[PDB]
Design a protein around this nucleic acid. Structure first.
Ligand SMILES: [Mg+2]
Ligand SMILES: [Mg+2]
Ligand SMILES: [Mg+2]
Ligand SMILES: [Mg+2]
Ligand SMILES: [Mg+2]
Ligand SMILES: [Mg+2]
Ligand SMILES: [Mg+2]
Ligand SMILES: [Mg+2]
Ligand SMILES: [Mg+2]
Ligand SMILES: [Mg+2]
Ligand SMILES: [Mg+2]
Ligand SMILES: [Mg+2]
Ligand SMILES: [Mg+2]
Ligand SMILES: [Mg+2]
Ligand SMILES: [Mg+2]
Ligand SMILES: [Mg+2]
Ligand SMILES: [Mg+2]
Ligand SMILES: [Mg+2]
Ligand SMILES: [Mg+2]
Ligand SMILES: [Mg+2]
Ligand SMILES: [Mg+2]
Ligand SMILES: [Mg+2]
Ligand SMILES: [Mg+2]
Ligand SMILES: [Mg+2]
Ligand SMILES: [Mg+2]
Ligand SMILES: [Mg+2]
Ligand SMILES: [Mg+2]
Ligand SMILES: [Mg+2]
Ligand SMILES: [Mg+2]
Ligand SMILES: [Mg+2]
Ligand SMILES: [Mg+2]
Ligand SMILES: [Mg+2]
Ligand SMILES: [Mg+2]
Ligand SMILES: [Mg+2]
Ligand SMILES: [Mg+2]
Ligand SMILES: [Mg+2]
Ligand SMILES: [Mg+2]
Ligand SMILES: [Mg+2]
Ligand SMILES: [Mg+2]
Ligand SMILES: [Mg+2]
Ligand SMILES: [Mg+2]
Ligand SMILES: [Mg+2]
Ligand SMILES: [Mg+2]
Lengths: 48, 150, 117, 103, 142, 22, 56, 110
RNA sequence: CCCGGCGAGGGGAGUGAAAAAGAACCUGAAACCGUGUACGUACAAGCAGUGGGAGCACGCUUAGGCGUGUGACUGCGUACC
RNA sequence: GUAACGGGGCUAAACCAUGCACCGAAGCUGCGGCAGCGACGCUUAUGCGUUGUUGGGUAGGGGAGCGUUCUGUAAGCCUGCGAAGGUGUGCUGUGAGGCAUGCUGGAGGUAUCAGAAGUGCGAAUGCUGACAUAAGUAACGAUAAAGCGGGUGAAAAGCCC
């Protein structure tokens, strides 16, 4: 072995949703925030 | 980014696009969105599993047969010109040597030799342990490993 | 860490401009109208692949009807005379024959006419 | 002088030495394929019409090439409802040489 | 190999004469239209002129069935704004006895440059004789 | 030699209250 | 007097089609010296059919 | 037997120079002076100057003699257009584009 | 040394491996306006393409008839967010 | 502007009544190909052949990835016989995309798994820097007003007399 023949196990790591990077990704122009409402701005959501 | 915290032109009126500052990060010489602060990327491992790593990789090292042990690996003079002649008849090229007591001579003669590092026996490490071709060990220094892994 | 993207950007653009060799005016020179045009080219190349079998069927039947009218029968009773002798030629080979092997076309309309009559 | 027959779910039309393109048959490169399922055979007004096929009809064919075709695009799109989809498809093809016609 | 398409230098072109004695205008027009376009010659191709030449003569002998001889109104238009010009059948025959066929065939021919260059090959004529005897046509008596 | 590149006149908001729609 | 949609190299060429230049069709050679001057025009050196009407 | 001669950074436009340099394509240099000496644009002195310098460089350096030459290629570029600022009304200003042209003249017999 | 206003700016001649490395100078892409070659375009109506397809010029090559460039002619077709 | 059959036009090429044929789509079916889900047997690359069946698709949920910068395999590998960058061609994967190579270019790129991201432009009346567009169009900053001889020069409508 070396420092080049290692790996994590099967599926221990995923990629993280880069939400806001295109159209073919499956994620896009809105970006996980829906449309037009208070769930779709900076400071989104409401309090508890 | 320092300086102008004033409106560069007013909101309505002039038909340019709306703008708040020269510090606005879509401009030349503005800030950026999300540059970091200084940080520390070091995580925390657990003690049991960190010792399990050294429990595992030495087993795989012996199963690969990349381990030599000698009674005392030493050259009896602080002079690299004999270490790089003993090793060429030891038939090695890039090895780690570990020793029990804090020897001065082997450390000094191996400091210049860029491949052949000499660690101690306590402060060994997984990455430089795995990153070599062969690893040699000491009849006394391996007993500290014997005590600290078990 | 501070990824300049000039290597990626023009290698992306020049593929589309290499796709767009031969369109009028701007859209074989400019980038961001050519990308709009090559996608329209993709949609039309999609649609006409479905429609080529529409159109060559829309073409072959005119030729077979013309040669059948030369021999003296309309196309519908020609296809009925083909199904009654049950011979499974399609309307590609007949559109070949009606141009080229007109004597075999006359023999075929004779066979279908006797099979219908 | 020529004949006409089925393969690939189709009705091609061949003659001697005509390197025709078929959609792939599961046979190897330099091999010999027969078909007795011809429909028409014309050899200078020796005309015969075969329902469903022709009794004494048999071809002789020698397959040559098993290659693949052309990267032709599949580009689906919709107006402003945010859906593009690219694809590039290439469809296999198989060439023969007609070595003989028999009726 | 691709499907056969006709080529214009070696496409053929005939010469025929059809007299318009006592025939229904539409039931002559569609026949002459489909013969002009060439849905009868076997080497037809939609984008190549696979056509012919047909002479029509004695245009004042077309019979039109019924009371359309006063209610088949030919409307055409100037460009100048008062000009919705309106001419009925018998007035059309009196003022110019040739448009009566050329309009009814201009309808049933395609409205592209193929048919619009084809429509030159309908050399209609008012009288029983002509000036094309050197072509020596044949009576296509339909 | 060389020269500058002027800009940004006091463009008077490009209009009066012209379109009196009331 | 705005534009609405932008003409291209096509029309910005085709507007030159009449505005381009026409050369002078032929000069003239003097009947007693043999040099090139315009028609109904004096030469540099003071020639217009022979006589030295002007010094230079 | 090509001979270049050029002339760069000259006070002319990019679309007035072609209106005189579309006269000197395919003529003996005699006629190419009998046209340029009486066309009356501004660039008719500049292209005359550069054609003179071209004809002389062929006279010197490539064996050529004066009346042999036939003007094969001539084309004019868009040089480095430097700029000024002139006031229009109400404080509005303009990068007025003082254009210029890299005149090239290529003469030969071949 | 040559042109040219004793110029600006060029052209050979020589520096260096290289002067479309010549000081507006490393590499020099796109919009862009140019020149030249091939083809097409003056009876033709439209989101400019796509599918069929003419003819013409030029390419490996025994004609094997295929790639290449234009695209007359014609089916369909009201851009993108 | 026919202009309340789509148009030509139609006494049937209309309407009603019966049929026998046909056209007619990406429906369906045939032929080849990838992928899902579930069967079933496995003879493992941890399941692989038959087998059914399905895959229009936004907001949106879940999976499989391609590529750019940077460290660690690297004091390795490739390169003055030509590295990074540009350019053209030629193949190639279901794709983001790679490999190979003629030309320019004259000192660096970089395996393979892996790790961390200022990581991917069509917009945002975004922002700078360049070039177009109207266009060789308007305008030349008072309607006090210039003409001529001589000189300087390669040059004169203004510059000197
Ligand atoms: Mg909501
Ligand atoms: Mg906010
Ligand atoms: Mg304040
Ligand atoms: Mg900063
Ligand atoms: Mg600790
Ligand atoms: Mg960087
Ligand atoms: Mg370009
Ligand atoms: Mg009236
Ligand atoms: Mg100088
Ligand atoms: Mg420069
Ligand atoms: Mg360098
Ligand atoms: Mg440079
Ligand atoms: Mg360029
Ligand atoms: Mg024409
Ligand atoms: Mg085609
Ligand atoms: Mg009216
Ligand atoms: Mg019925
Ligand atoms: Mg179908
Ligand atoms: Mg289906
Ligand atoms: Mg299949
Ligand atoms: Mg879907
Ligand atoms: Mg979705
Ligand atoms: Mg690396
Ligand atoms: Mg490069
Ligand atoms: Mg490269
Ligand atoms: Mg090089
Ligand atoms: Mg070097
Ligand atoms: Mg370096
Ligand atoms: Mg980014
Ligand atoms: Mg951009
Ligand atoms: Mg966008
Ligand atoms: Mg913008
Ligand atoms: Mg801008
Ligand atoms: Mg402008
Ligand atoms: Mg302009
Ligand atoms: Mg104007
Ligand atoms: Mg004006
Ligand atoms: Mg004016
Ligand atoms: Mg004034
Ligand atoms: Mg003034
Ligand atoms: Mg004076
Ligand atoms: Mg004055
Ligand atoms: Mg004075």
């Amino acid at each position: 072995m070396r420092l080049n023949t290692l790996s994590p196990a099967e599926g221990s790591k995923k990629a993280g949703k880069r939400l806001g990077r295109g159209i073919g990704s499956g994620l896009g122009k809105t970006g996980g925030r829906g449309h037009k409402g208070q769930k779709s701005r900076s400071g989104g959501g409401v309090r508890r | 980014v320092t300086g102008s915290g004033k409106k560069p032109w007013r909101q309505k009126g002039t038909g340019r696009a709306r703008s708040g500052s020269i510090k606005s990060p879509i401009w030349r010489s503005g800030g950026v969105t999300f540059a970091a602060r200084p940080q520390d990327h070091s995580q925390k491992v657990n003690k049991k599993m960190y010792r399990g790593a050294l429990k595992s990789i030495l087993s795989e090292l012996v199963r690969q047969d990349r381990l030599i042990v000698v009674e005392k690996f030493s050259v009896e003079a602080p002079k690299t010109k004999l270490l790089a002649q003993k090793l060429k008849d030891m038939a090695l090229e890039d090895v780690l040597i570990i020793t029990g007591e804090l020897d001065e001579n082997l450390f000094l003669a191996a400091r210049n030799l860029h491949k052949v590092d000499v660690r101690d026996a306590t402060g060994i490490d997984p990455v430089s342990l795995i990153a070599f071709d062969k690893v040699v060990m000491t009849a006394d220094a391996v007993k500290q490993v014997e005590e600290m892994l078990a | 860490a501070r990824v300049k993207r000039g290597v990626i950007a023009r290698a992306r653009h020049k593929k589309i401009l290499k796709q767009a060799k031969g369109y009028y005016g701007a859209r074989s020179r400019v980038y961001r109208v050519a990308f709009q045009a090559v996608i329209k080219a993709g949609q039309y190349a999609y649609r006409d692949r479905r429609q080529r079998k529409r159109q060559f069927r829309q073409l072959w039947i005119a030729r077979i009807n013309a040669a059948a009218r030369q021999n003296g029968i309309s196309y519908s009773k020609f296809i009925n005379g083909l199904k009654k002798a049950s011979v499974e030629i399609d309307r590609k080979i007949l559109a070949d024959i009606a141009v080229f092997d007109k004597v075999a076309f006359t023999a075929l309309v004779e066979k279908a006419k006797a099979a219908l009559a | 002088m020529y004949a006409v027959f089925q393969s690939g779910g189709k009705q091609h039309r061949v003659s001697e030495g005509q390197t025709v393109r078929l959609e792939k048959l599961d046979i190897a490169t330099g091999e010999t394929v027969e078909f007795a399922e011809v429909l028409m055979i014309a050899n200078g007004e020796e005309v015969k019409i075969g329902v469903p096929f022709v009794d004494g009809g048999v071809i002789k064919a020698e397959v040559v090439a098993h290659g693949r075709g052309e990267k032709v695009k599949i580009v689906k799109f919709r107006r402003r409802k945010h859906y593009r989809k690219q694809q590039g498809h290439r469809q296999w093809f198989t060439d023969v040489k007609i070595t003989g016609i028999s009726a | 190999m691709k499907t056969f398409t006709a080529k214009p230098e070696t496409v053929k072109r005939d010469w025929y004469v059809v007299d318009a004695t006592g025939k229904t205008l539409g039931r002559l027009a569609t026949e002459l239209a489909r013969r002009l376009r060439g849905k009868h010659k076997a080497e037809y191709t939609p984008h190549v002129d696979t056509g012919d030449y047909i002479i029509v003569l004695n245009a004042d002998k077309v019979a039109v069935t019924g009371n359309k001889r006063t209610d088949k109104v030919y409307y055409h238009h100037t460009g100048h704004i008062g000009g919705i010009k309106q001419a009925t059948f018998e007035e059309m025959i009196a003022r110019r006895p040739e448009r009566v066929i050329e309009i009814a065939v201009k309808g049933m021919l395609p409205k592209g440059p193929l048919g619009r260059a084809m429509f030159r090959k309908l050399k209609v004529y008012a009288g029983n004789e002509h000036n094309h005897a050197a072509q020596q046509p044949q009576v296509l008596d339909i | 030699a060389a020269a500058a590149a002027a800009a940004a006149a006091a463009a008077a908001a490009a209009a009066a209250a012209a379109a009196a729609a009331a | 007097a705005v534009q609405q949609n932008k003409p291209t190299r096509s029309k910005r060429g085709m507007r030159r089609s009449h505005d381009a230049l026409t050369a002078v069709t032929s000069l003239s050679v003097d009947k007693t010296s043999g040099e090139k001057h315009l028609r109904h025009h004096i030469t540099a050196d003071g020639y217009y059919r022979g006589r030295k009407v002007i010094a230079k | 037997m090509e001979t270049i001669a050029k002339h760069r950074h000259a006070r002319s436009s990019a679309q007035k120079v072609r209106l005189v340099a579309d006269l000197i394509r395919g003529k003996k240099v005699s006629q190419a002076l009998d046209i340029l000496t009486y066309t009356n644009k501004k660039a008719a002195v500049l292209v005359k100057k550069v054609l003179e310098s071209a004809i002389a460089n062929a006279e010197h350096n490539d064996g050529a003699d004066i009346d042999d030459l036939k003007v094969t290629k001539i084309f004019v570029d868009e040089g480095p257009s430097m700029k000024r600022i002139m006031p229009r009304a109400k404080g509005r200003a303009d990068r007025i584009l003082k254009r210029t042209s890299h005149i090239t003249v290529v003469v030969s017999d071949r």
